[PDB]
């Protein structure tokens, strides 16, 4: 059934599973036309497919050409997502295929179920959690590869960098969701926090800065404060 606070440790057991977030698949800018009507212009998007245990991210870049001449794009985007996730699963060796796929939005359930009919033993699950994966495009290196793409492309990132050498998957996922929640609530502040100290660099093969254990505690504290601050600025508390 649905994935929620109660069955949260299941994410870090040894059954392979993937989260799929389709928020950033179909992305547009809305603008005025010369005649004063409104039109959209699509920009490149991406499917965010994440193994929460290992940090393995299969970032499938969705190039604007896939929308050319199509109608009802918000609906098509869900089916395109499901087609690409199905293709990914089929590309993986049997022992790497997931036992469960958790979609972050319930409207992905039927498209993904229909595309995965060939895999009756792979459970397709919703979640009650409000996960912040839409903020993936606030990670500079991810946004850069999406915007520069000239054709459909799959790119591989470990979203935990090397954290799993020092912390457990549970702790890594909690750090990731904190960083992403912060970037989602106030991107400018969050990014100021992460880069304020010019002596802490991001390795070429990494996404996040090379914080020591002690610096991660400070960073994490600054992100929590931001989220509460913004929560007070929003609600006046």
């Amino acid at each position: 059934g649905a994935m929620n606070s109660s069955n949260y440790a299941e994410l870090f057991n040894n059954d392979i599973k993937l989260f799929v977030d389709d928020t950033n698949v179909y992305r547009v800018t809305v603008h005025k036309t010369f005649e004063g009507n409104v039109a959209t212009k699509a920009i490149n998007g991406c499917i965010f497919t994440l193994n929460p245990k290992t940090g393995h991210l299969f970032l499938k870049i969705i190039h604007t050409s896939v929308w050319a001449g199509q109608k009802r794009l918000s609906q098509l985007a869900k089916w395109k997502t499901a087609e690409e996730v199905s293709a990914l699963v089929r590309s993986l060796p049997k022992e790497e295929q997931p036992k469960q796929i958790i979609v972050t939005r319930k409207a992905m359930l039927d498209p993904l179920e229909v595309h995965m009919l060939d895999f009756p033993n792979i459970a397709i699950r919703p979640t009650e959690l409000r996960l912040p994966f839409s903020a993936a495009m606030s990670i500079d290196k991810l946004s850069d590869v999406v915007m520069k793409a000239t054709e459909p492309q799959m790119v591989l990132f470990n979203i935990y960098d090397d954290w799993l050498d020092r912390i457990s998957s549970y702790t890594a996922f909690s750090r990731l969701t904190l960083l992403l929640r912060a970037l989602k609530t106030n991107e400018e502040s969050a990014k100021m926090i992460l880069l304020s100290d010019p002596t802490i660099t991001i390795k070429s093969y990494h996404l996040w800065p090379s914080f020591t254990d002690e610096q991660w505690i400070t960073i994490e504290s600054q992100m929590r404060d931001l989220i509460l601050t913004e929560y007070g600025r929003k609600y006046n508390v």
Binding site: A82, E83, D110, P111, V114, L117
Partner: protein
């Protein structure tokens, strides 16, 4: 005009014959029903006064044999049987009629209700849904489950309706996932009509039979089947024009005949709202939409 005679009525029972029903008192001089119109299937059904649990009944066609009812005190029900001795049967019926012991099927001459509810229903197709090949008539009751219900437990007592499942490989062509899920025309016209049913008359026959089992026995799996067969048509963008016109007539008479006080359980809100207001065929069911809105505007 044909006759379904009864050896007696030893237990108090409400007896239905098609859309009509009547009450028989315990050990009341009763020897059955006469003047049954030839040319249609018929259903004779029972609800005991002491145990409204289990409505049960028999589908039959008097052209296929001489049938009578006899109570079995061991199994505790009214059973249908065939009398092979034609002369013996005619004699019994003639004597019953001379004694005015048989009630009269109350058919009004202007009234086409039963024809309209059974237009496409054939006894031979009933006997393939209800498998008991040693009898020419078919038993159905409130509790019998469908093949599909059993997949999700006694197979000899099952309703073998055609399985319809919108999220199945039968329904969804590889490579046409979105197309076939949002527009079920392939599944309707190629898989079901051309492939399984062969023509729309057999499809409508099963649809009508499922509705009638839902209405008369409260058979939940039959209700599921009736709604699935409606939804498969309404969710197809491409349906033969003759089928849409006929479906509107079929559903009109079904909704017209439904007891008002049973609509809560026998009508699925989601399917009907989708079919009348959101589906491809939202504009193709004028008669059905008009009777639904004037009779059940709450459900919608």
């Amino acid at each position: 005009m044909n006759t379904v005679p009864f050896t007696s009525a030893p237990i108090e029972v409400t007896i239905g014959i098609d859309q009509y029903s009547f009450n028989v008192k315990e050990n009341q001089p009763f020897h059955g029903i006469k003047d049954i119109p030839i040319g249609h299937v018929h259903v004779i059904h029972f609800q005991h006064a002491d145990n409204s649990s289990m409505r049960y009944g028999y589908w039959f066609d008097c052209r296929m044999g001489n049938f009578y009812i006899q109570y079995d005190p061991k199994d505790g029900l009214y059973k249908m049987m065939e009398e092979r001795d034609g002369a013996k049967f005619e004699n019994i019926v003639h004597n019953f009629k001379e004694r005015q012991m048989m009630v009269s099927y109350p058919k009004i001459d202007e009234d086409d209700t039963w024809y309209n509810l059974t237009e496409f229903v054939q006894m031979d197709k009933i006997r393939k849904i209800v498998r008991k090949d040693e009898n020419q008539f078919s038993y159905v009751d409130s509790s019998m489950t469908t093949v599909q219900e059993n997949e999700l437990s006694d197979p000899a007592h099952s309703l073998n309706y055609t399985v319809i499942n919108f999220k199945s490989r039968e329904a969804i062509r590889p490579g046409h996932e979105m197309e076939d899920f949002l527009d079920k025309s392939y599944y309707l016209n190629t898989v079901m009509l051309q492939g399984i049913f062969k023509n729309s008359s057999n499809y409508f026959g099963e649809l009508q039979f499922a509705f009638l089992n839902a209405m008369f026995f409260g058979n939940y799996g039959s209700s599921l089947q009736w709604h699935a067969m409606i939804e498969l048509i309404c969710s197809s963008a491409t349906v033969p024009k003759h089928m849409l016109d006929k479906l509107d007539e079929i559903l009109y008479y079904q909704i017209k005949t439904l007891p008002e006080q049973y609509s809560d359980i026998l009508l699925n809100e989601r399917v009907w709202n989708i079919c009348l207001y959101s589906s491809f065929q939202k504009n193709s069911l004028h008669n059905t939409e008009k009777i639904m809105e004037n009779k059940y505007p709450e459900l919608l």
